[PDB]
């Protein structure tokens, strides 16, 4: 359009380009769109492309000051959803120029943050986003990633073991350090603050950091293995966040954690850059299937959020538990794991992957398993997550009848028995009970752990 | 209630009972089948937490015979009978160790 | 190469990949190379790919710690120079 004509217009003629082949540099998005009744699919897809890019609810004269054809998002393909009929899949391409370099949420909130519909869409859901390699290279990514983290902690050949201190709230700093010390000396690689342990009246953050670090050094000397505790630096302001991270580094803490939900993207991205500058490992917690990622027809799918968290940066990523999930979503669990750790993820509709995602050299992220898991879950966990994972047993360790050290040892024995059995070629999920029962013959701690919780 | 007895550990598999010949052999077979190169490191017991142990010769790149690895473990043992001895498996695709465990805890 | 063998070797077998299609992410270079007399073009192009990337004048055991096939620069095409005959064009991807 070369001439200005005020007034509301349809979006199909500008924002629906069925003959458009996406450039390699394009940000691609797959939306599950349920259009308003009567509205054609091509128009509704065009409406989402307009509102998430250069479109306005009415024609503006300022469009003619730039070239819309270059800058606009444009829907280029529509596909039926297998199962539903109301919804359809819109594939929309966004020129890479639309986004701030190294600011992956600026992609995200442009796409769905403030995209209400332009009166043509009654339901939107962002399924997948292809971040082109050109854009990936501008993001910080994980400050260290799997391979460097293993080198720094000198840990090889098995999943790492962690544990959140319980109760979630209420412990004094010294009692917190006692719990940490007992877990670490018993065989856990890591302990961690609970996500909502920041700096409360019952335990100020600086006191916690000091006692925890003393606990970490003591257990490391008494086991001869490197130990860590994710010190939670999540804070109300960035200054406070950086101050706590600086104190963690000052006292020699190898690893910190950040609640991405509490803190937000800006804080997390800054923290991840800080962590790479200061050689501190960064554990990220972002609950999924909670508010944002649980509704199957309304919201942002967790694999998009997973991609964002990897670009924003984190050496570990945790959402929810995987074993309690059904065998059906286990295929989605395996696809989730691959987005975190692999360099190139090919398209696979069965797993929910609509685009090839190329990470290039961006480091992978440790996948974290938590939840109400105990020793009996260990075979499934080892089989599903493999070696490049952290298995966190909070209640499973502090809930052992003989205390933290024994609980840590039980989990450590169970983990190593499963890893050894896997390396011997045994099907550890099918033979799980027998593997644990045999290892329990030499580990009284494991024996009573298996009696404490049910197979 | 039983009291947990604190002792020094040796990372992966050190919480299991000490490995016999078959269990060691099976791990080396696993590492070779993964396409990893077995290697042998050794160090004085007090230095076991160093990042850089002594490397025994070079990693046995492209070694397919488990018995060759076992023989070199024995050779390293004889050369340094008081050292801790570790079997490592280099993964050149990850530039990491796919596997590592202490075969002799030293003295 | 999976096994370590010390000594000077030719570069053609590692650093000359005439069937290599450059990835969109590859740094591509065009060199006008005049080879030493007797040296084949494919070898000299391989030599420039080696020295400008992961190559050493003699075989080193540390190559086996990483994957050379991923990291190496590799010459993938050779073209005559229009005018000269001593020189040729080497296209090398990094």
């Amino acid at each position: 359009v070369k001439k200005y004509s005020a007034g509301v217009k349809e979006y199909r003629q500008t924002y629906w380009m069925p003959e458009y082949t996406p450039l390699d540099s394009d940000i691609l998005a797959c939306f599950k769109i349920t259009p308003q009744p009567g509205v054609d699919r091509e128009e509704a897809a065009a409406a989402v492309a307009a509102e998430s890019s250069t479109g306005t609810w009415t024609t503006v004269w300022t469009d003619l000051l730039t070239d819309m054809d270059y800058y606009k998002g444009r829907a280029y393909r529509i596909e039926d959803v297998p199962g539903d009929d109301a919804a359809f899949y819109a594939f929309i391409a966004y020129p890479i120029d639309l986004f701030e370099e190294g600011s992956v949420v600026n992609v995200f909130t442009s796409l769905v943050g403030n995209v209400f519909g332009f009166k043509a869409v009654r339901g939107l859901r962002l399924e997948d986003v292809r971040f082109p390699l050109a854009y990936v290279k501008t993001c910080g990514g994980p400050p260290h990633g799997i391979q460097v983290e293993r080198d720094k902690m000198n840990k090889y050949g098995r999943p790492l073991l962690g544990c959140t201190i319980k109760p979630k709230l209420g412990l004094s700093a010294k009692n917190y350090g006692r719990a940490v010390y007992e877990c670490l000396r018993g065989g856990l690689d890591f302990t961690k603050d609970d996500e909502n342990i920041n700096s409360q009246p019952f335990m100020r953050w600086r006191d916690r950091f000091l006692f925890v670090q003393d606990a970490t050094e003591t257990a490391e000397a008494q086991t001869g293995e490197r130990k860590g505790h994710y010190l939670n630096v999540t804070a109300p302001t960035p200054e406070e966040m950086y101050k706590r991270a600086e104190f963690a580094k000052e006292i020699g803490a190898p690893i910190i954690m950040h609640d991405y939900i509490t803190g937000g993207f800006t804080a997390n991205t800054g923290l991840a850059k800080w962590c790479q500058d200061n050689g501190v490992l960064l554990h990220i917690h972002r609950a999924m299937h909670a508010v944002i990622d649980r509704n199957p027809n309304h919201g942002i799918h967790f694999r998009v959020l997973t991609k964002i968290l990897r670009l924003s940066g984190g050496d570990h990523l945790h959402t929810g538990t995987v074993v309690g999930k059904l065998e059906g979503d286990r295929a989605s669990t395996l696809g989730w794991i691959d987005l975190l750790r692999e360099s190139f993820i090919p398209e696979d509709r069965s797993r929910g992957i609509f685009f090839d995602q190329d990470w290039g050299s961006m480091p992978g992220v440790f996948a974290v398993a938590s939840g109400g898991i105990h020793v009996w879950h260990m075979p499934a966990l080892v089989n599903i997550f493999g070696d490049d994972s952290v298995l966190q047993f909070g209640g499973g360790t502090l809930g052992h009848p003989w205390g933290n050290a024994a609980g840590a040892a039980a989990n450590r024995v169970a983990l190593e028995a499963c890893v050894e059995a896997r390396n011997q070629g045994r099907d550890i999920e099918k033979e799980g009970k027998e593997i644990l029962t045999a290892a329990a013959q030499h580990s009284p701690e494991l024996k009573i752990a298996m009696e404490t919780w049910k197979e | 209630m039983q009291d947990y007895k604190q002792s020094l550990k040796y990372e992966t598999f050190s919480y299991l009972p000490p490995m016999n010949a078959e269990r060691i052999r099976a791990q080396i077979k696993y590492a070779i089948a993964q396409g990893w190169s077995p290697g042998i490191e050794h160090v004085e017991v007090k230095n076991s937490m160093n990042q850089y142990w002594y490397m025994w010769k070079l990693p046995f790149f492209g070694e397919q015979n488990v018995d060759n690895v076992l023989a070199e473990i024995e050779a390293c043992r004889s050369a340094y009978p008081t050292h801790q001895v570790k079997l490592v498996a280099y993964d050149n695709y990850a530039q990491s160790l796919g596997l590592a465990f202490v075969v002799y805890r030293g003295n | 190469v999976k096994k370590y063998s010390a000594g000077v070797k030719e570069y053609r077998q590692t650093y000359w990949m005439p069937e290599y299609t450059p990835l969109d992410s590859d740094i591509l270079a065009c060199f006008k190379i005049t080879p030493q007399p007797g040296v084949d073009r494919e070898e000299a192009a391989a030599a420039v790919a080696a020295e400008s990337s992961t190559g050493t004048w003699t075989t080193v055991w540390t190559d086996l710690l990483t994957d050379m096939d991923y990291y190496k620069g590799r010459a993938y095409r050779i073209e005559d120079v229009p005018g000269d005959d001593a020189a040729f064009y080497a296209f090398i991807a990094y």
């Binding site: 391979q147 360099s343 190139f344 290039g360 480091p363 | 695709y93 990850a94 | 990835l23």
Partner: peptide
């Protein structure tokens, strides 16, 4: 891992 599953491969 890392370079085993590249787009280059």
């Amino acid at each position: 891992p890392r370079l085993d599953l590249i787009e280059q491969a």
